[PDB]
Copies of this chain bind each other. A is one copy, B any other.
């Protein structure tokens, strides 16, 4: 799924906080070729994250997915705990998205043990198909 694009060495997918909101998250409901076809669809909360790399269409130390919009939602042998401060993403002065940090703890809150597996969950600002886009990676 990589060299359908025929990429030269050194090139990587380094999307902005801004691109992810506008070009990916927003465009999927609309049906875009490169958008329908370039990122794997999955319910992230059914699995332990260390299973995910083999199920991701690509990635070397980071992976991206679309997952159903929703607390300490259970996944595998653990739970996701919000960390840091949600940040607002703007393009040309409009709020289009929110970047949210999470940390995976194994076990059951608040008796869980922290792990190094991390998520960044990006969402659009809007009232009541409807997905969030998530980045996964491993610390240190």
A residues lining the B interface (CB < 8 Å): 5-16, 19-20, 23-24, 34-35, 38
Contacts and interface: CB of A to CB of B under 8 A. Distances in A.
B9 A11 contact: no
A20 B10 contact: yes
Contact of A19 (B9, B13, B14, B24): B9
B9 A6 contact: no
A19 B23 contact: no
Nearest to A8: B5
B13 A10 contact: yes
A72 B54 CA distance: 43
Contacts of A10: 13-16, 19-20, 23-24
Contact of A15 (B9, B13, B19): B9
A14 B15 contact: no
Q: Which of A8, A13, A15, A20 has the most CB of B within 10 A?
A: A8
Given A9-B19, A10-B13, A10-B23, 12 more contacts: A5-B8, A7-B11, A9-B24, A9-B34, A10-B14, A10-B15, A10-B16, A10-B19, A10-B20, A11-B11, A11-B13, A12-B13
A7 to B, nearest CB: 7
